[PDB]
């Protein structure tokens, strides 16, 4: 039995795709997260699940693997023939394999393809378009590995409650993308209020958390609907690098964004209207330049931190600019005076 299941720990941990909900037996413990860890979509995007959900899955599975009552059973993470659920569930167990079983992304993906099962559906973006850029499960696992490699997260210290608190629009709609360096959020409004259920936040709402977390600088990329004075008077620096919603940034805007961030001491809070497309795109440019993430790796990492980031042509833009951005990184490092 378990025909076509994917083995992750010899005779102990498996991943299965099942038409119907199975029943745990005296030998096999079955569990699914398809209805527990649910992606919140903007449009037709369906994943990857965010970093807090990865964390919650890993906690859940580690507990099952330490349970005495389950110690003599095979543990089987199962998902359905809903390919959008299945892709997220495969991403979750693959991410567990990378983070906790010390597998490479390629080894984890090999196990995911080991059984007799169809391929995994790639993740799409949050735009109205028909899908044009395939973000694969392997891409996401590569992004997890790179984020781990460069210390962009640490599940020994990750605070999932706080992540899931501040991601909500009533609490500021923000996520850290690079700890101590980049915070992404939706653009503040002139007056704090609640308009048609949807709460709006003024610049001053953010002053406490920013000050407490060494946020020194705000970069705005969308239309002005508040005075930059409101931040600068509070001691923050503020920069305007506007480009059209849904567009790709010019060479000039990229160079200026990078100049700002490279000459900035503390953390930088970046926003557009939603804090997803324009914001994710420019942050990715910096991370590609200075950490040599590939386009797929950074699109994965930023979406795992902040779902819906990097939209439509911005995806292909990052792929088309990768070689250039890596070269700009080499040139940047060739001028340093360190050691």
């Amino acid at each position: 039995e378990l025909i076509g299941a994917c083995e992750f720990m010899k005779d102990r941990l498996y991943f299965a795709t099942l038409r119907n909900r199975p029943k745990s037996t005296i030998n096999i413990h079955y569990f699914s997260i398809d209805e527990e860890l649910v992606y919140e979509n903007f449009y037709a995007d369906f994943g990857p699940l965010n970093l807090a959900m990865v964390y919650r899955y890993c906690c859940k599975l580690n507990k099952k693997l330490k349970s005495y009552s389950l110690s003599r059973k095979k543990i089987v993470h199962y998902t359905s023939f809903d390919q959008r659920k299945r892709a997220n569930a495969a991403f979750l167990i693959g991410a567990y394999a990378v983070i906790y079983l010390k597998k490479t992304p390629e080894e984890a993906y090999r196990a995911l393809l080991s059984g007799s099962n169809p391929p995994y559906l790639p993740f799409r973006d949050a735009s109205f378009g028909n899908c044009t850029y395939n973000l694969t499960v392997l891409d996401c696992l590569q992004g997890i590995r790179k984020g781990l490699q460069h210390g962009f997260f640490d599940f020994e210290t990750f605070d999932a409650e706080e992540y899931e608190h501040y991601e909500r629009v009533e609490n500021g709609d923000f996520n850290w993308i690079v700890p101590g360096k980049f915070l992404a959020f939706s653009g503040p409004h002139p007056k704090s209020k609640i308009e048609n259920g949807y709460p709006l936040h003024a610049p001053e709402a953010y002053f406490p958390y920013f000050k407490k977390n060494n946020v020194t600088t705000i970069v705005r990329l969308n239309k002005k609907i508040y005075e930059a004075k409101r931040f600068t008077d509070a001691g923050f620096e503020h920069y305007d690098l506007f480009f059209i919603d849904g567009s790709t940034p010019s060479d000039n805007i990229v160079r200026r964004f990078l100049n700002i961030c490279e000459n900035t001491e503390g953390a930088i809070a970046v926003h557009s209207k939603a804090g997803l497309g324009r914001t994710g795109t420019l942050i990715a440019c910096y991370v590609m330049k200075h950490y040599r993430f590939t386009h797929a790796e950074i699109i994965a990492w930023i979406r795992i931190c902040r779902p819906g980031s990097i939209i439509g042509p911005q995806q292909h833009f990052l792929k088309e600019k990768q070689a250039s951005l890596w070269v700009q990184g080499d040139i940047f490092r060739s001028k340093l005076k360190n050691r």
Partner: peptide, 4 residues
């Protein structure tokens, strides 16, 4: 093309 940011969501709304």
């Amino acid at each position: 093309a940011s969501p709304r």
